[PDB]
Every structure is written in C-alpha cells, then in structure tokens.
Design a binder for this molecule. Structure first.
Ligand SMILES: [Cl-]
Ligand SMILES: [Cl-]
Lengths: 383, 387
C-alpha cells in the first residue's frame, strides 16, 4: 500500500511560480556617492588616493543605486564594524539574526498577498541566507513571524553564496512536484552586515565587495497543479534544474567565516571560467537569442563574458543589468528581482508570454565552487 | 512540458539502499573521560569539579564516545582548551578539513555496500552543524569523493540534531521526483565547534561535553531499485513530516560566536518533547492512526537518556523499541544528526542477524524521529522489507 500512497501523495504537473514578492532596506545609497559616504564613516577621508581608487571601482560596477541596512548611524554605534579586522562577529550576528528573518518576512508577505490563498495552505518553507547562522535558524523565525502552520516542512540554507537563488528554486521544484497540493514558500534574504569591512590595506576584495553587494530580500510561491478556479495564475513553469561546479576553481570565489566577519575572495578568472564553461550546461539543458534570460548579476564582467560567449544582443540582459543598476548584487536574491521584472514587464507590455514573448528561458546562478545553477523555464500566457 | 514531467519522474518510493558509518579512531570511555577532559584543560586539581563532571557523565548512560579532539590535537591548538577564547578561526581551520574528510569515510563505506560506481550518483546532501565555509563541505566532499561535476548538492549548515531526518526528508523528494536519481546523503558531526573547557557554571556545556560525540554517516537513497545490478533495498520512506513545538524556541539554543558554538539545553526539553510527540505522530501518519505504538518499530534520536525515557513512557513503548537507540547512545554518545543513521544501520543489521522477517525487527511499519532546536521534530514513516 506504500506504492498506493506514493501516487496518492505526488503531484502531476511541473512546478510553477505562482507569485513573487521583493523587499529592500529603506535607505538607498547611490553608487556615485557611496565612496564619499564609505570613507567618511570609517574616518578615512584623508586617504584621497585610496578614495579615488574606490571611486573608480564603484564606477565600473555599472551600479547606480543600492539599498543597505548599515546606515551611517548603525556604524557610528558599533565602532568594531569600522575597525579593519577587529572582532565583530557577535555584533554582526546580533543584527543579522533579527533582521534576516524580518526582511524575509517583508518580502514573503508581498508574495503571499499576490498569491491570495490563505497562509494555512503553505506546506513548505525554503529560507536562504548567506549571513546570520543561528539555531534555530531564520527558517523557523520567519515561519514564526509569518504565522505559518507548525507543520511547515522547512529547509534552511546558510552560507551558500550567490548561486543559492537557483538552488532554492531547484529544491522547490522537487518539493512542489513530489507532493500533491504542496505550496512551497521560498525566502531569500541577503544583508551585507556579515561582509562589511573598512577601507583596504591589501583587502580590496572587500572594496570590490563593498561596491558590488547590496541588501534585499525575495520570496516566491512555487506549486504544481495550479488552480485557476480559485485564482492561481502560474508565472513560469520549471522544466529542469541542474547544478555543476567548475572543476578547477575551488579558490576562484571563496568565503571564510572568521571572528571579524565573513572574508570573501573574488579572483579575476571568474568571468573567464564562467564564459569558457557556460556553454556546457546550456547544450545539455538551440538559438540563444530565441530565449529569455535571467542571469545572476554577479558583476558586469561576468555579464559581458556570458553575453559575449553566447552571442546575445543587448536586449537579452536588459532585465538583469537593470537589477544590477538599481539594487546592486544582492547575492541569491538577485535572480528573483530579475524574474519579477521580466514577468511584470511582459504582463504590462501585453507580450504573448510571461517571458518577454518567448516560450523558453534559462536562469543562472553563480557562486562559490565555482558553482553554476541552470534552470530551464517555460513562459506562460498572459490571460 | 507535462510529458517531460512524467518521463523524468520516478515511480516507487524513496528507498535506503546502503548505509555507511565512520568515527574518529580515538575512543574515549565515559568513566575515563573526566580524567582526560580535566587533564587536557589543565584542570587536574579541580577534584570537586571533576567529581561533579563524573556525575553528569554517569547520568548520560554513555559508555564511550569517539572524539576527534585528542590530547595531541588540543595541544596543537591550546585556544580550544581556553574557555570562551577566540578560537572560531582555529575551530574552522580544523572543521573545514575534517568535516568533509570524516564524511568521506562514511561515504565510501555506503558506496562499497551500494556496489555501484560513484558515476551514477546524481545528488549529494551534506549536513553538518559546524564548519560553515564557501564553498561548503558538500563541495569539498564531492571533490574528495571525485563525484560527478554535475551532482546536485544540498548543503545543510548549523541545523542541529533533527537534521538527520531533514536530510532523509529532502532525499525522499529528490529520489522520488527524478527517475534514475541516486541520492548520496552525508552527515558529519564533529565536536570541534562545540568543544569547551570545564566551567562549574556552564551546565549546558558540561552536558554537551559529556553527551556529544564525533561521527559521520552516509546513505544511498533512490527509487525504483535495480536488483540485478546489486542494489538491496533496506527501508522504504512512506511519509516525511516536520513540526516545531510552539513556544519552545528558547528550550534549545545555538549561537555561533567568536568563541565557537554556544548552545543551551534546558531541563524542560524532555517534558516538552513528550507532551507533543503525538502531535507529530498523527501528522506524519497523514490519515492513518495507530491504536498501539508498539505495533511499529522505532528509530528515535538519542538526544539523552531523559528524553528517551519520557518518549518511551509517554507512548508506553516496550523496552525492545529503544534497544537500538540506547545501544548507539551507549556506544557512541549523541552524534547530533548522525545518530539516527547509526540506529537505522543497527536495526537492519540486527534484524538480519536474528533472522527477522523484516529489516525492521519483524515489523512492517516504523517511525523515525529527529529532535533539534525549534523545538523541531522530524517524523518519518518507514516501510520495512521482507527476508
Ligand atoms: Cl505536503
Ligand atoms: Cl537526476
């Protein structure tokens, strides 16, 4: 009878995205003014040559705006954040354990409101955050703040990196497709409390990270067997979710949790390693310009290397480069912002499908490994 | 797309096809642990403190634990022997190396029993409380094992002791939703991140120092097993549920600090778990009800003798139900998420040694329990197989 339960318990259709909600800390910092803010709060305005070096770094990110939790006052009250390598892991944990679930709940409510169904029908919760490891984790805190059922099956993804956007979706695919009537709440929340560092004396990776990473949170509802009779509208259908690590790049992008916070390292072979090894996962998963693209905006060098290797016209990266410009690199949250804009803009423009008129698409995540997450999406009609 | 969905979907239930376990070689017996634990921490003088710790070690009903932190190891890193001193950088330097390596040991064993080459492994779920790193231990263990570049990895960090059932619950969906999928689970719990020095006050750490032991586990989970190639089904997973007991998030804490993992375990945890065990029972058994909890076999996470007795009492379980659980607790201590895997392997092996009709002590249906911070209760209904 266990094989009878197996069919009575599984869903039938592919996992579909039923709703998307986003959030960001209120304070926005314009990239053209961040270097002047960054060197002031650290009390390094006298380092003119280092300040103009950090300006040029921020100019070349193509980022125009970023939302950050760490305001000038928060840094003023926690001086250990402004010391280069002083022990500040505890003071970082103190803000992160509280704010990670809070910003996540903020984005989760927007997704739930759009979805429109009662919270009781949420059966799973996938919470993803790079920073703020705690026991119990943010998956429990967010479920507690949202008021979900005690029976919510939770998955807590800590310290994964920027690729975890595709990971969350790849996990939600199996949970939603394998369980009849399941409605998976995904929550990605990234706040740069754990990676903030002061100006550099041989740590410009932080400067490269200070100029690139921004704060934000995202949430989706993923479920199979969408039900229009109640008002469920599927946005995209997930067709396949793959993951591979770039063989020779264990140290290309690494992150080590220390007593002075998270110390990251991003080498300059990442664009070359991705571009040279991106076509493999694509052929396994066709004319590249006949697809819509949701690429993780890890940086403009990565975007150009991907855009050049696949011979994509600028049109394909518009949604991606818009998110990078208006929010920066938000780690695993970024691809949800891009997906959200693509589908809203397609629904607004009256396109033939939710994927900018195209029927097939590809979503990318890039992170430590180097890890590449590749998800094949199926756009759906606009009413 | 709906045709791609049906064609890439597995048929039967997720099945455990192999189990492999591993521990750090150096064994430490509980009666001798106070003499050792107080010598390495330069506290041989504290006779009353050492006797107080003996009492706690005796109440654990543990006979021996396999620990990585030996006398030579703790002397290589004296900052671990320092109570609440900066040692996360030191702890991580040992965790990022050992967590994968110890996981690799158990992994190879399960792959040896499995009989298939590591070429057919499609997913790797790695779980470990300590040693958060980027890329994670899931990647390092995939690299040490030489797994496929395209393995779909899941990295569970800082979860707690229930995470053993969380792994299987995840493995259940990955194996059943993908035809041909072979999921490698790897749990690796080493007390490097939780090791602390004797403090007469810190009752939680004294409990944790006398309760937690090092160990690694690994299983092969997959649906639609191929008997002709050498795959032997052990247990079939029927239902995987999770629950958090309301208003109990302060009972079991866990804060990663600059001095390592600072955990708290309060004495109402036994009571808290026993009062709400039936709620997780009824939910996991979906619509099925049980008029006698002894009509099933049991795999309970041995968080401690007080929790085992309360669960056994609440459910009125026969002593034979906790035998495999109390054996693992006795022989290895609390290995966090790893412990239930030792119990499952003890159950299926002991069942075959006695010639039981099923791999679950002659009983067809069984329940697996994980307990952790939340309070979180992982409940998994298991199906046993014949001969
Ligand atoms: Cl469900
Ligand atoms: Cl697969």
């Amino acid at each position: 009878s266990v094989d009878q339960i197996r069919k009575a318990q599984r869903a039938n259709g592919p996992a579909t995205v039923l709703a998307i909600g986003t959030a960001n800390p209120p304070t926005s910092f314009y990239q053209a003014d961040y270097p002047d803010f960054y060197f002031r709060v650290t009390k390094n305005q006298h380092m003119t040559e280092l300040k103009d070096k950090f300006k040029r770094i921020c100019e070349k990110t193509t980022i125009k705006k970023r939302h950050l939790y760490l305001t000038e006052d928060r840094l003023n009250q926690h001086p250990n954040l402004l010391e280069y390598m002083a022990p500040s892991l505890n003071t970082r944990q103190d803000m992160l354990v509280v704010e990670i679930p809070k910003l996540g709940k903020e984005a989760a409510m927007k997704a739930i409101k759009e979805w429109g169904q009662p919270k009781s029908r949420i059966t799973h919760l996938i919470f993803c955050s790079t920073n703020g490891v705690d026991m119990p984790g943010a998956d429990y805190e967010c479920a507690k703040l949202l008021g979900l059922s005690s029976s919510v099956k939770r998955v807590m993804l800590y310290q994964q990196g920027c690729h975890a956007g595709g990971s969350v979706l790849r996990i939600a695919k199996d949970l939603a497709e394998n369980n009849k009537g399941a409605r998976i709440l995904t929550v990605n929340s990234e706040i740069t409390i754990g990676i903030f560092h002061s100006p550099d004396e041989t740590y410009f990776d932080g400067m490269v990270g200070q100029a690139l990473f921004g704060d934000g949170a995202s949430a989706t509802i993923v479920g199979a067997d969408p039900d229009k009779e109640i008002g469920e509208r599927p946005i995209f259908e997930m067709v396949s979710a793959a993951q591979e690590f770039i063989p020779n790049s264990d140290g290309a992008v690494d992150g080590h949790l220390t007593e002075a916070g998270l110390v990251y390292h991003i080498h300059k072979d990442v664009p070359g390693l991705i571009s040279k090894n991106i076509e493999k996962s694509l052929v396994e998963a066709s004319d590249w310009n006949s697809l819509f693209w949701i690429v993780h905006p890890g940086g403009p060098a990565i975007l150009n290397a991907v855009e050049a290797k696949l011979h994509l016209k600028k049109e394909k990266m518009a949604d991606t480069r818009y998110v990078l410009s208006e929010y920066g690199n938000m780690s695993s949250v970024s691809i949800f912002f891009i997906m959200d804009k693509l589908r809203k803009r397609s629904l607004e423009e009256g396109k033939s499908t939710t994927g900018d008129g195209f029927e097939w698409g590809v979503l990318f995540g890039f992170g430590p490994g180097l890890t590449v997450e590749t998800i094949v999406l199926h756009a759906l009609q606009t009413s």
